[PDB]
Amino acid sequence: IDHKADLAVAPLAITYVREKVIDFSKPFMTLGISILYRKPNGTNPGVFSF
Amino acid sequence: IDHKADLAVAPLAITYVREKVIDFSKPFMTLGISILYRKPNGTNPGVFSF
């Protein structure tokens, strides 16, 4: 806003409110949400591992 | 290019060249290159298998 600076390249989600007050170029790479998980391990319950 | 239209709400892919000629809004949906393939007929069809 204050023109103390210019285009600010950094992690910057071009959201609804931001374009109201700033102008943003078209995104160079898309995003989204996924789940993070620890992949399973060979510790079979073995109550019945038959 | 000659404004015979003003808008085009179409599945049109933005390219380097066409943007040099035309102006585009932010992409409303994205896409890519996946692979078509038939799942392998479910479980293998083996019979009379003594």
Side-chain angles (χ1 to χ4, degrees):
Chain A
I1 289 168
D2 303 333
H3 292 89
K4 304 191 286 284
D6 301 308
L7 60 85
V9 169
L12 176 54
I14 301 169
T15 192
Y16 173 47
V17 62
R18 291 178 203 270
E19 187 42 56
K20 296 264 185 53
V21 68
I22 320 164
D23 174 285
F24 303 91
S25 80
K26 277 186 201 37
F28 38 80
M29 72 76 58
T30 62
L31 204 61
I33 299 91
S34 86
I35 314 301
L36 165 65
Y37 210 87
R38 162 200 272 112
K39 60 176 82 58
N41 46 29
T43 49
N44 173 328
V47 178
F48 296 151
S49 178
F50 305 143
Chain B
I1 185 174
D2 58 353
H3 311 71
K4 298 289 103 176
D6 48 30
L7 269 74
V9 289
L12 184 56
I14 298 173
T15 186
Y16 172 64
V17 175
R18 76 181 78 251
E19 172 49 47
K20 197 171 303 191
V21 182
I22 315 292
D23 167 50
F24 302 136
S25 73
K26 307 286 161 206
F28 59 102
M29 61 79 71
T30 68
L31 63 90
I33 296 90
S34 57
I35 308 93
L36 290 173
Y37 184 65
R38 176 154 95 238
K39 293 179 179 179
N41 219 304
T43 59
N44 159 79
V47 175
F48 198 47
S49 167
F50 292 103

Coordinates of all heavy atoms in Angstrom, one line a residue:
Chain A
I1 N 0.8 -1.2 0.0 CA 0.0 0.0 0.0 C 0.9 1.3 0.0 O 0.8 2.0 -0.9 CB -0.9 0.0 1.2 CG1 -2.0 -1.0 1.1 CG2 -1.5 1.4 1.4 CD1 -2.8 -1.3 2.4
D2 N 1.7 1.4 1.1 CA 2.3 2.7 1.3 C 3.4 3.0 0.3 O 4.1 4.0 0.4 CB 3.0 2.6 2.7 CG 2.0 2.3 3.8 OD1 0.8 2.7 3.6 OD2 2.3 1.7 4.8
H3 N 3.6 2.1 -0.7 CA 4.6 2.3 -1.7 C 6.0 2.5 -1.1 O 6.9 3.1 -1.8 CB 4.3 3.4 -2.7 CG 3.1 3.1 -3.5 ND1 1.8 3.4 -3.1 CD2 3.0 2.6 -4.7 CE1 0.9 3.0 -4.0 NE2 1.6 2.5 -5.0
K4 N 6.2 2.1 0.1 CA 7.6 1.9 0.7 C 8.3 0.8 -0.1 O 9.5 0.8 0.0 CB 7.5 1.6 2.1 CG 6.7 2.5 3.0 CD 6.9 2.2 4.5 CE 6.2 1.0 4.9 NZ 4.7 1.2 5.0
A5 N 7.6 0.0 -0.8 CA 8.1 -1.1 -1.5 C 7.2 -1.4 -2.7 O 6.4 -0.5 -3.1 CB 8.2 -2.4 -0.6
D6 N 7.4 -2.6 -3.3 CA 6.8 -2.9 -4.6 C 6.2 -4.2 -4.5 O 5.7 -4.7 -3.4 CB 7.9 -2.8 -5.7 CG 8.6 -1.5 -5.7 OD1 7.9 -0.5 -5.8 OD2 9.9 -1.4 -5.6
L7 N 6.0 -4.9 -5.7 CA 5.8 -6.3 -5.7 C 6.5 -7.1 -4.6 O 7.7 -6.9 -4.4 CB 6.1 -6.9 -7.1 CG 7.5 -6.7 -7.7 CD1 8.5 -7.9 -7.2 CD2 7.5 -6.7 -9.2
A8 N 5.8 -7.9 -3.9 CA 6.4 -8.7 -2.7 C 6.3 -10.1 -3.0 O 5.2 -10.8 -2.8 CB 5.7 -8.3 -1.4
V9 N 7.3 -10.7 -3.5 CA 7.3 -12.2 -3.9 C 7.7 -13.0 -2.6 O 8.8 -12.9 -2.1 CB 8.3 -12.5 -5.0 CG1 8.5 -13.9 -5.2 CG2 7.8 -11.9 -6.3
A10 N 6.7 -13.8 -2.2 CA 6.9 -14.7 -1.0 C 5.6 -15.5 -0.9 O 4.7 -15.3 -1.7 CB 7.1 -13.8 0.3
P11 N 5.6 -16.5 -0.1 CA 4.3 -17.2 0.1 C 3.2 -16.3 0.4 O 3.1 -15.6 1.5 CB 4.6 -18.2 1.3 CG 6.1 -18.4 1.2 CD 6.7 -17.3 0.5
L12 N 2.3 -16.2 -0.5 CA 1.3 -15.2 -0.6 C 0.0 -15.7 -1.3 O 0.0 -15.8 -2.5 CB 1.8 -14.0 -1.4 CG 0.8 -12.9 -1.6 CD1 0.2 -12.4 -0.2 CD2 1.5 -11.7 -2.3
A13 N -1.0 -16.1 -0.4 CA -2.2 -16.6 -1.0 C -3.0 -15.5 -1.5 O -3.4 -14.6 -0.8 CB -3.0 -17.4 0.1
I14 N -3.3 -15.5 -2.8 CA -4.1 -14.4 -3.4 C -5.5 -14.6 -3.0 O -6.3 -15.2 -3.7 CB -3.9 -14.3 -4.9 CG1 -2.4 -14.2 -5.3 CG2 -4.6 -13.2 -5.5 CD1 -2.1 -14.4 -6.7
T15 N -5.9 -14.0 -1.9 CA -7.3 -14.2 -1.4 C -8.2 -13.0 -1.7 O -7.8 -12.1 -2.3 CB -7.2 -14.4 0.2 OG1 -8.5 -14.9 0.6 CG2 -7.0 -13.1 0.9
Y16 N -9.4 -13.2 -1.3 CA -10.5 -12.3 -1.7 C -10.2 -10.9 -1.2 O -10.3 -9.9 -2.0 CB -11.8 -12.8 -1.1 CG -13.0 -12.0 -1.3 CD1 -13.3 -11.4 -2.5 CD2 -13.9 -11.8 -0.2 CE1 -14.5 -10.6 -2.6 CE2 -15.0 -11.0 -0.4 CZ -15.3 -10.4 -1.6 OH -16.4 -9.6 -1.7
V17 N -9.9 -10.7 0.1 CA -9.7 -9.4 0.6 C -8.4 -8.8 0.1 O -8.4 -7.6 -0.1 CB -9.7 -9.5 2.2 CG1 -8.6 -10.4 2.7 CG2 -9.6 -8.1 2.8
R18 N -7.4 -9.6 -0.2 CA -6.1 -9.0 -0.6 C -6.3 -8.3 -1.9 O -5.7 -7.2 -2.1 CB -5.1 -10.0 -0.7 CG -4.6 -10.6 0.7 CD -3.6 -11.7 0.5 NE -3.6 -12.6 1.6 CZ -2.8 -12.4 2.7 NH1 -2.0 -11.3 2.7 NH2 -2.8 -13.3 3.7
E19 N -6.9 -8.9 -2.9 CA -7.1 -8.2 -4.2 C -7.9 -7.0 -4.1 O -7.8 -6.1 -5.0 CB -7.7 -9.2 -5.2 CG -7.7 -8.7 -6.7 CD -6.4 -7.9 -7.0 OE1 -5.3 -8.5 -6.9 OE2 -6.5 -6.8 -7.4
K20 N -8.7 -6.8 -3.0 CA -9.4 -5.6 -2.8 C -8.5 -4.4 -2.7 O -8.8 -3.3 -3.1 CB -10.3 -5.7 -1.6 CG -11.4 -6.8 -1.7 CD -12.7 -6.2 -2.0 CE -13.8 -7.3 -2.0 NZ -13.7 -8.0 -0.7
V21 N -7.3 -4.6 -2.0 CA -6.4 -3.6 -1.7 C -5.1 -3.7 -2.4 O -4.4 -2.7 -2.4 CB -6.2 -3.6 -0.1 CG1 -5.4 -4.8 0.3 CG2 -5.5 -2.3 0.3
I22 N -4.8 -4.8 -3.0 CA -3.5 -5.0 -3.7 C -3.9 -5.6 -5.1 O -4.9 -6.2 -5.2 CB -2.5 -5.8 -3.0 CG1 -2.5 -5.4 -1.5 CG2 -1.1 -5.5 -3.5 CD1 -1.7 -6.4 -0.7
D23 N -3.0 -5.5 -6.0 CA -3.1 -6.2 -7.3 C -2.0 -7.3 -7.3 O -0.9 -7.1 -7.0 CB -2.8 -5.2 -8.4 CG -2.8 -5.9 -9.8 OD1 -1.7 -6.6 -10.1 OD2 -3.7 -5.8 -10.5
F24 N -2.5 -8.5 -7.7 CA -1.6 -9.7 -7.7 C -1.6 -10.4 -9.1 O -2.6 -10.5 -9.7 CB -2.2 -10.7 -6.7 CG -2.3 -10.2 -5.3 CD1 -3.5 -9.6 -4.9 CD2 -1.2 -10.2 -4.4 CE1 -3.6 -9.1 -3.6 CE2 -1.3 -9.7 -3.2 CZ -2.5 -9.1 -2.8
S25 N -0.4 -10.8 -9.5 CA -0.2 -11.5 -10.7 C -0.8 -12.8 -10.6 O -1.2 -13.3 -9.6 CB 1.3 -11.5 -11.1 OG 1.9 -12.6 -10.4
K26 N -1.0 -13.5 -11.8 CA -1.6 -14.8 -11.7 C -0.6 -15.8 -11.0 O 0.6 -15.8 -11.3 CB -1.9 -15.3 -13.1 CG -3.2 -14.8 -13.6 CD -3.6 -15.4 -15.0 CE -4.6 -14.5 -15.7 NZ -4.3 -13.1 -15.5
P27 N -1.1 -16.7 -10.2 CA -0.3 -17.5 -9.3 C 0.7 -18.4 -10.2 O 0.2 -19.0 -11.2 CB -1.2 -18.4 -8.5 CG -2.5 -17.6 -8.5 CD -2.5 -16.9 -9.8
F28 N 1.9 -18.5 -9.8 CA 2.9 -19.3 -10.4 C 2.9 -20.8 -10.0 O 3.6 -21.6 -10.7 CB 4.3 -18.7 -10.1 CG 4.4 -18.3 -8.7 CD1 4.6 -19.2 -7.6 CD2 4.3 -16.9 -8.3 CE1 4.7 -18.7 -6.3 CE2 4.4 -16.5 -7.0 CZ 4.6 -17.4 -6.0
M29 N 2.1 -21.1 -9.0 CA 2.0 -22.5 -8.6 C 0.8 -22.6 -7.6 O 0.6 -21.7 -6.8 CB 3.3 -22.9 -7.9 CG 3.7 -22.4 -6.6 SD 2.7 -23.1 -5.2 CE 3.2 -24.8 -5.4
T30 N 0.0 -23.6 -7.8 CA -1.2 -23.8 -7.1 C -0.9 -24.5 -5.7 O 0.2 -24.8 -5.4 CB -2.2 -24.6 -7.9 OG1 -1.7 -25.9 -8.1 CG2 -2.5 -23.9 -9.2
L31 N -2.0 -24.6 -4.9 CA -1.8 -25.1 -3.6 C -3.0 -26.0 -3.2 O -3.6 -26.6 -4.1 CB -1.7 -23.9 -2.6 CG -1.0 -24.0 -1.3 CD1 0.4 -24.4 -1.5 CD2 -1.1 -22.8 -0.4
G32 N -3.2 -26.1 -2.0 CA -4.3 -26.9 -1.5 C -4.0 -27.6 -0.2 O -2.9 -27.5 0.3
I33 N -4.9 -28.4 0.3 CA -4.8 -28.9 1.6 C -4.8 -30.4 1.5 O -5.6 -31.0 0.8 CB -5.9 -28.4 2.5 CG1 -5.9 -26.9 2.7 CG2 -5.9 -29.1 3.9 CD1 -6.7 -26.2 1.6
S34 N -3.9 -31.1 2.2 CA -3.8 -32.5 2.3 C -3.6 -33.0 3.7 O -3.3 -32.1 4.6 CB -2.7 -33.1 1.4 OG -1.5 -33.1 2.0
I35 N -3.7 -34.2 4.0 CA -3.5 -34.7 5.3 C -2.1 -35.3 5.5 O -1.5 -35.9 4.6 CB -4.6 -35.8 5.7 CG1 -5.9 -35.3 5.2 CG2 -4.6 -36.0 7.2 CD1 -6.3 -34.0 5.9
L36 N -1.6 -35.1 6.7 CA -0.2 -35.5 7.1 C -0.3 -36.7 8.0 O -1.1 -36.7 9.0 CB 0.6 -34.4 7.7 CG 1.8 -35.0 8.4 CD1 2.7 -35.5 7.4 CD2 2.5 -33.9 9.2
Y37 N 0.4 -37.8 7.7 CA 0.3 -39.0 8.5 C 1.6 -39.8 8.5 O 2.4 -39.7 7.5 CB -0.8 -39.9 7.9 CG -1.5 -40.7 8.9 CD1 -2.6 -40.2 9.6 CD2 -1.0 -42.0 9.2 CE1 -3.2 -41.0 10.6 CE2 -1.6 -42.7 10.1 CZ -2.7 -42.3 10.8 OH -3.3 -43.0 11.8
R38 N 1.8 -40.6 9.5 CA 2.9 -41.5 9.6 C 2.5 -42.8 9.0 O 1.6 -43.5 9.5 CB 3.3 -41.7 11.1 CG 4.2 -42.9 11.3 CD 4.1 -43.4 12.7 NE 5.2 -42.8 13.5 CZ 4.9 -41.9 14.5 NH1 3.7 -41.6 14.8 NH2 5.9 -41.4 15.2
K39 N 3.2 -43.2 7.9 CA 2.9 -44.4 7.2 C 2.9 -45.6 8.2 O 3.8 -45.7 9.0 CB 3.8 -44.6 6.0 CG 5.2 -44.8 6.4 CD 6.0 -45.1 5.2 CE 6.3 -43.8 4.4 NZ 7.1 -42.8 5.2
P40 N 2.0 -46.6 8.0 CA 2.0 -47.8 9.0 C 3.3 -48.5 9.1 O 4.2 -48.4 8.2 CB 0.9 -48.7 8.5 CG 0.0 -47.8 7.7 CD 1.0 -46.8 7.0
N41 N 3.5 -49.3 10.1 CA 4.7 -50.1 10.4 C 4.4 -51.6 10.5 O 3.2 -51.9 10.8 CB 5.6 -49.5 11.5 CG 4.8 -49.2 12.8 OD1 3.7 -49.9 13.0 ND2 5.2 -48.3 13.5
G42 N 5.4 -52.5 10.3 CA 5.2 -53.9 10.3 C 5.0 -54.4 11.8 O 5.8 -55.2 12.3
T43 N 3.9 -53.9 12.5 CA 3.7 -54.4 13.8 C 2.2 -54.8 13.6 O 1.3 -54.1 14.0 CB 3.8 -53.4 15.0 OG1 3.1 -52.2 14.6 CG2 5.2 -53.0 15.2
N44 N 2.1 -56.0 13.0 CA 0.8 -56.6 12.9 C 0.2 -56.9 14.2 O 1.0 -57.3 15.1 CB 0.9 -57.8 12.0 CG -0.4 -58.6 11.8 OD1 -1.2 -58.7 12.8 ND2 -0.6 -59.2 10.7
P45 N -1.1 -56.7 14.5 CA -1.7 -57.0 15.7 C -1.3 -58.4 16.2 O -1.1 -58.6 17.4 CB -3.2 -56.9 15.5 CG -3.3 -56.6 14.0 CD -2.0 -56.0 13.6
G46 N -1.3 -59.4 15.3 CA -0.9 -60.7 15.7 C -1.6 -61.4 16.8 O -1.2 -62.5 17.3
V47 N -2.7 -60.9 17.3 CA -3.7 -61.6 18.0 C -4.0 -62.8 17.1 O -3.8 -64.0 17.5 CB -4.9 -60.8 18.4 CG1 -5.9 -61.6 19.2 CG2 -4.5 -59.6 19.3
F48 N -4.6 -62.5 16.0 CA -4.7 -63.4 14.9 C -4.0 -62.8 13.7 O -4.6 -62.1 12.8 CB -6.2 -63.6 14.6 CG -7.0 -64.3 15.7 CD1 -8.3 -64.0 15.8 CD2 -6.3 -65.1 16.5 CE1 -9.0 -64.6 16.9 CE2 -7.0 -65.7 17.6 CZ -8.3 -65.5 17.7
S49 N -2.7 -63.2 13.6 CA -1.9 -63.0 12.4 C -1.9 -64.3 11.5 O -0.9 -64.5 10.9 CB -0.5 -62.5 12.7 OG 0.2 -62.4 11.5
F50 N -2.9 -65.1 11.6 CA -3.0 -66.3 10.8 C -4.1 -66.1 9.8 O -4.6 -65.0 9.6 CB -3.3 -67.5 11.7 CG -2.3 -67.6 12.7 CD1 -2.7 -68.0 14.0 CD2 -1.0 -67.2 12.6 CE1 -1.8 -68.1 15.0 CE2 -0.1 -67.2 13.6 CZ -0.5 -67.7 14.8
Chain B
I1 N -10.2 -10.0 -30.2 CA -9.2 -9.1 -30.5 C -9.8 -7.8 -31.1 O -9.3 -6.7 -30.8 CB -8.1 -9.7 -31.5 CG1 -7.0 -8.7 -31.7 CG2 -8.8 -10.0 -32.8 CD1 -5.9 -9.3 -32.5
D2 N -10.9 -7.9 -31.8 CA -11.6 -6.7 -32.3 C -12.9 -6.4 -31.5 O -13.8 -5.7 -32.0 CB -12.0 -6.9 -33.8 CG -12.8 -8.1 -34.0 OD1 -13.0 -8.9 -33.1 OD2 -13.2 -8.3 -35.2
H3 N -13.0 -7.0 -30.3 CA -14.1 -6.7 -29.4 C -15.5 -7.1 -29.9 O -16.5 -6.6 -29.5 CB -14.1 -5.3 -28.9 CG -12.8 -4.8 -28.4 ND1 -11.8 -4.5 -29.3 CD2 -12.4 -4.4 -27.2 CE1 -10.7 -4.1 -28.6 NE2 -11.1 -4.0 -27.3
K4 N -15.5 -8.0 -30.9 CA -16.8 -8.5 -31.4 C -17.6 -9.2 -30.2 O -18.8 -9.2 -30.1 CB -16.7 -9.4 -32.6 CG -16.1 -8.8 -33.8 CD -17.0 -7.8 -34.4 CE -16.7 -6.3 -34.1 NZ -17.6 -5.4 -34.8
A5 N -16.8 -9.7 -29.3 CA -17.3 -10.2 -28.0 C -16.6 -9.3 -27.0 O -15.6 -8.7 -27.2 CB -17.0 -11.6 -27.7
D6 N -17.1 -9.3 -25.8 CA -16.5 -8.7 -24.6 C -16.0 -9.8 -23.6 O -15.1 -9.5 -22.8 CB -17.4 -7.7 -23.9 CG -18.8 -8.2 -23.7 OD1 -19.0 -9.4 -23.5 OD2 -19.7 -7.3 -23.7
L7 N -16.7 -10.9 -23.6 CA -16.4 -12.0 -22.6 C -16.4 -13.3 -23.3 O -16.8 -13.5 -24.5 CB -17.5 -12.0 -21.6 CG -17.3 -11.2 -20.3 CD1 -17.5 -9.7 -20.6 CD2 -18.3 -11.6 -19.3
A8 N -15.8 -14.3 -22.6 CA -15.9 -15.7 -23.1 C -15.7 -16.6 -21.9 O -14.6 -16.8 -21.4 CB -14.8 -16.0 -24.1
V9 N -16.8 -17.2 -21.4 CA -16.7 -18.1 -20.3 C -16.7 -19.5 -20.8 O -17.6 -20.2 -21.1 CB -17.9 -17.9 -19.3 CG1 -17.8 -16.6 -18.6 CG2 -19.2 -17.9 -20.1
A10 N -15.4 -20.0 -21.1 CA -15.2 -21.2 -21.8 C -14.1 -22.0 -21.2 O -13.3 -21.4 -20.3 CB -14.8 -20.8 -23.3
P11 N -13.9 -23.2 -21.5 CA -12.8 -24.0 -21.0 C -11.5 -23.7 -21.8 O -11.0 -24.6 -22.5 CB -13.2 -25.5 -21.3 CG -14.7 -25.4 -21.5 CD -14.9 -24.1 -22.1
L12 N -11.1 -22.4 -21.8 CA -10.0 -22.0 -22.6 C -8.7 -22.0 -21.9 O -8.6 -21.3 -20.8 CB -10.3 -20.7 -23.3 CG -9.2 -20.3 -24.3 CD1 -9.1 -21.4 -25.3 CD2 -9.5 -19.0 -24.9
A13 N -7.7 -22.6 -22.4 CA -6.4 -22.7 -21.7 C -5.5 -21.5 -22.1 O -5.2 -21.3 -23.3 CB -5.6 -24.0 -22.1
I14 N -5.1 -20.8 -21.1 CA -4.2 -19.6 -21.2 C -2.9 -20.1 -21.7 O -2.3 -21.0 -21.1 CB -4.1 -18.8 -19.9 CG1 -5.5 -18.3 -19.5 CG2 -3.1 -17.7 -20.1 CD1 -5.5 -17.7 -18.1
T15 N -2.3 -19.5 -22.7 CA -1.0 -19.7 -23.2 C -0.2 -18.4 -23.2 O -0.8 -17.4 -23.1 CB -0.9 -20.4 -24.5 OG1 0.4 -20.8 -24.8 CG2 -1.3 -19.5 -25.6
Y16 N 1.1 -18.6 -23.3 CA 2.0 -17.4 -23.4 C 1.6 -16.5 -24.5 O 1.5 -15.3 -24.4 CB 3.4 -17.9 -23.6 CG 4.4 -16.8 -24.0 CD1 4.7 -15.8 -23.1 CD2 5.0 -16.8 -25.2 CE1 5.6 -14.9 -23.4 CE2 5.9 -15.8 -25.5 CZ 6.2 -14.8 -24.6 OH 7.1 -13.9 -24.9
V17 N 1.3 -17.1 -25.7 CA 1.1 -16.2 -26.9 C -0.3 -15.5 -26.8 O -0.4 -14.3 -27.1 CB 1.2 -17.1 -28.2 CG1 0.8 -16.3 -29.4 CG2 2.6 -17.7 -28.3
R18 N -1.3 -16.2 -26.4 CA -2.7 -15.7 -26.4 C -2.8 -14.5 -25.3 O -3.5 -13.6 -25.6 CB -3.7 -16.7 -26.1 CG -3.8 -17.2 -24.7 CD -4.9 -18.3 -24.5 NE -4.4 -19.6 -24.9 CZ -4.9 -20.3 -26.0 NH1 -5.8 -19.7 -26.8 NH2 -4.4 -21.5 -26.3
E19 N -2.1 -14.6 -24.2 CA -2.1 -13.5 -23.3 C -1.4 -12.3 -23.8 O -1.8 -11.2 -23.5 CB -1.4 -14.0 -22.0 CG -1.2 -12.9 -21.0 CD -2.4 -12.0 -20.7 OE1 -3.5 -12.6 -20.5 OE2 -2.3 -10.8 -20.8
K20 N -0.4 -12.5 -24.7 CA 0.3 -11.4 -25.3 C -0.7 -10.6 -26.2 O -0.5 -9.5 -26.5 CB 1.4 -11.9 -26.2 CG 2.4 -10.8 -26.6 CD 3.6 -11.4 -27.3 CE 4.3 -12.4 -26.4 NZ 5.7 -12.8 -26.9
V21 N -1.9 -11.2 -26.5 CA -2.8 -10.6 -27.4 C -4.1 -10.3 -26.6 O -4.8 -9.3 -26.9 CB -3.1 -11.6 -28.6 CG1 -4.1 -11.0 -29.6 CG2 -1.8 -11.9 -29.3
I22 N -4.5 -11.2 -25.7 CA -5.7 -11.1 -25.0 C -5.5 -11.0 -23.5 O -4.4 -11.4 -23.0 CB -6.7 -12.2 -25.3 CG1 -6.6 -12.5 -26.8 CG2 -8.1 -11.9 -24.9 CD1 -7.3 -11.3 -27.6
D23 N -6.4 -10.5 -22.7 CA -6.3 -10.3 -21.3 C -7.3 -11.3 -20.6 O -8.4 -11.5 -21.1 CB -6.7 -8.9 -20.9 CG -6.9 -8.7 -19.4 OD1 -6.0 -9.2 -18.6 OD2 -7.9 -8.2 -19.0
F24 N -6.8 -11.9 -19.5 CA -7.5 -13.0 -18.9 C -7.7 -12.7 -17.4 O -6.8 -12.0 -16.7 CB -6.7 -14.3 -19.1 CG -6.5 -14.6 -20.5 CD1 -5.2 -15.0 -21.0 CD2 -7.5 -14.5 -21.4 CE1 -5.0 -15.3 -22.3 CE2 -7.3 -14.8 -22.8 CZ -6.1 -15.2 -23.2
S25 N -8.7 -13.3 -16.8 CA -8.9 -13.3 -15.4 C -8.2 -14.4 -14.7 O -7.7 -15.3 -15.4 CB -10.4 -13.3 -15.1 OG -10.9 -14.6 -15.3
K26 N -8.2 -14.4 -13.4 CA -7.5 -15.5 -12.7 C -8.1 -16.8 -13.0 O -9.4 -16.9 -13.0 CB -7.5 -15.2 -11.2 CG -6.9 -13.9 -10.8 CD -5.4 -13.8 -11.0 CE -4.9 -12.4 -11.1 NZ -3.7 -12.3 -11.8
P27 N -7.4 -17.9 -13.2 CA -7.9 -19.2 -13.5 C -8.8 -19.7 -12.4 O -8.4 -19.8 -11.2 CB -6.7 -20.1 -13.7 CG -5.6 -19.2 -14.0 CD -5.9 -17.9 -13.3
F28 N -10.1 -20.0 -12.7 CA -11.1 -20.4 -11.8 C -11.0 -21.9 -11.5 O -11.5 -22.3 -10.4 CB -12.5 -20.1 -12.3 CG -12.8 -20.7 -13.7 CD1 -13.6 -21.9 -13.7 CD2 -12.2 -20.3 -14.8 CE1 -13.8 -22.5 -14.9 CE2 -12.5 -20.9 -16.0 CZ -13.3 -22.0 -16.1
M29 N -10.3 -22.7 -12.3 CA -10.1 -24.1 -12.1 C -8.9 -24.5 -12.8 O -8.5 -23.9 -13.9 CB -11.3 -24.9 -12.5 CG -11.7 -24.8 -13.9 SD -10.7 -25.8 -15.1 CE -11.3 -27.4 -14.6
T30 N -8.2 -25.5 -12.3 CA -6.9 -26.0 -12.8 C -7.1 -27.4 -13.3 O -8.1 -28.1 -13.1 CB -5.8 -25.9 -11.7 OG1 -6.1 -26.8 -10.7 CG2 -5.8 -24.5 -11.1
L31 N -6.0 -27.8 -14.0 CA -6.1 -29.2 -14.6 C -4.6 -29.5 -15.0 O -3.7 -28.7 -14.9 CB -7.0 -29.1 -15.8 CG -6.6 -28.2 -17.0 CD1 -5.8 -28.9 -18.0 CD2 -7.9 -27.6 -17.6
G32 N -4.5 -30.8 -15.5 CA -3.2 -31.3 -15.8 C -3.2 -32.5 -16.7 O -4.1 -32.6 -17.5
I33 N -2.2 -33.3 -16.6 CA -2.0 -34.4 -17.5 C -1.8 -35.7 -16.6 O -0.8 -35.9 -16.1 CB -0.8 -34.3 -18.4 CG1 -1.0 -33.1 -19.4 CG2 -0.5 -35.5 -19.2 CD1 -0.5 -31.8 -18.8
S34 N -2.9 -36.4 -16.4 CA -2.9 -37.7 -15.8 C -3.0 -38.8 -16.9 O -3.0 -38.5 -18.1 CB -4.1 -37.9 -14.8 OG -5.3 -37.6 -15.5
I35 N -3.2 -40.0 -16.5 CA -3.1 -41.1 -17.5 C -4.4 -42.0 -17.4 O -4.8 -42.3 -16.3 CB -1.9 -42.0 -17.2 CG1 -0.6 -41.2 -17.1 CG2 -1.8 -43.1 -18.3 CD1 -0.3 -40.8 -15.7
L36 N -5.0 -42.2 -18.6 CA -6.1 -43.2 -18.6 C -5.6 -44.6 -18.6 O -4.6 -44.9 -19.2 CB -6.9 -42.9 -19.9 CG -7.6 -41.6 -19.9 CD1 -8.3 -41.4 -21.3 CD2 -8.7 -41.7 -18.8
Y37 N -6.4 -45.4 -17.9 CA -6.0 -46.8 -17.8 C -7.1 -47.7 -17.3 O -7.8 -47.2 -16.3 CB -4.8 -47.0 -16.9 CG -4.3 -48.5 -17.0 CD1 -3.9 -49.0 -18.1 CD2 -4.4 -49.2 -15.8 CE1 -3.5 -50.4 -18.1 CE2 -4.0 -50.5 -15.8 CZ -3.6 -51.1 -17.0 OH -3.2 -52.4 -17.0
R38 N -7.3 -48.8 -17.9 CA -8.3 -49.8 -17.4 C -7.8 -50.5 -16.1 O -6.8 -51.1 -16.2 CB -8.7 -50.8 -18.5 CG -9.7 -51.8 -18.0 CD -10.5 -52.4 -19.1 NE -10.0 -53.7 -19.6 CZ -9.6 -53.9 -20.9 NH1 -9.8 -52.9 -21.8 NH2 -9.1 -55.0 -21.3
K39 N -8.6 -50.4 -15.1 CA -8.2 -51.3 -13.9 C -8.1 -52.7 -14.4 O -8.9 -53.1 -15.3 CB -9.3 -51.1 -12.8 CG -9.3 -49.7 -12.1 CD -10.4 -49.6 -11.1 CE -10.4 -48.2 -10.4 NZ -11.5 -48.1 -9.4
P40 N -7.2 -53.6 -13.8 CA -7.0 -54.9 -14.4 C -8.1 -56.0 -14.1 O -7.7 -57.0 -13.5 CB -5.7 -55.3 -13.7 CG -5.7 -54.6 -12.3 CD -6.5 -53.3 -12.6
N41 N -9.3 -55.7 -14.6 CA -10.4 -56.8 -14.5 C -10.5 -57.3 -13.1 O -10.7 -58.5 -12.9 CB -10.2 -57.9 -15.6 CG -11.5 -58.4 -16.2 OD1 -12.4 -58.8 -15.5 ND2 -11.6 -58.3 -17.5
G42 N -10.4 -56.4 -12.1 CA -10.6 -56.7 -10.7 C -9.5 -57.7 -10.2 O -8.3 -57.5 -10.6
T43 N -9.9 -58.8 -9.5 CA -9.0 -59.9 -9.0 C -8.5 -60.7 -10.2 O -9.3 -60.9 -11.2 CB -9.6 -60.7 -7.9 OG1 -10.8 -61.3 -8.4 CG2 -9.9 -59.9 -6.7
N44 N -7.3 -61.3 -10.2 CA -6.9 -62.1 -11.4 C -8.0 -63.2 -11.7 O -8.4 -63.8 -10.7 CB -5.5 -62.7 -11.3 CG -5.3 -63.8 -12.2 OD1 -5.0 -63.7 -13.4 ND2 -5.3 -65.0 -11.7
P45 N -8.4 -63.4 -13.0 CA -9.3 -64.5 -13.2 C -8.7 -65.9 -13.4 O -8.6 -66.3 -14.6 CB -9.9 -64.1 -14.6 CG -8.9 -63.3 -15.3 CD -8.1 -62.6 -14.1
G46 N -8.3 -66.5 -12.3 CA -7.7 -67.9 -12.4 C -8.6 -68.9 -11.9 O -9.2 -68.6 -10.8
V47 N -8.9 -70.0 -12.6 CA -9.8 -71.1 -12.2 C -9.1 -72.4 -12.4 O -8.0 -72.4 -13.0 CB -11.2 -71.0 -12.8 CG1 -12.0 -72.1 -12.4 CG2 -11.8 -69.6 -12.4
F48 N -9.8 -73.5 -12.1 CA -9.3 -74.8 -12.2 C -7.8 -74.8 -11.9 O -6.9 -75.1 -12.7 CB -9.5 -75.4 -13.6 CG -9.4 -76.9 -13.8 CD1 -10.0 -77.7 -12.9 CD2 -8.7 -77.4 -14.8 CE1 -9.9 -79.1 -13.0 CE2 -8.5 -78.8 -14.9 CZ -9.2 -79.6 -14.0
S49 N -7.5 -74.4 -10.6 CA -6.1 -74.1 -10.3 C -5.5 -75.0 -9.2 O -4.6 -74.6 -8.5 CB -6.0 -72.7 -9.8 OG -4.8 -72.5 -9.1
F50 N -6.0 -76.3 -9.1 CA -5.2 -77.2 -8.4 C -3.8 -77.3 -9.0 O -2.8 -77.2 -8.3 CB -5.9 -78.6 -8.3 CG -7.1 -78.7 -7.5 CD1 -8.4 -78.7 -8.0 CD2 -7.0 -78.8 -6.1 CE1 -9.6 -78.8 -7.2 CE2 -8.2 -78.9 -5.3 CZ -9.4 -78.9 -5.8

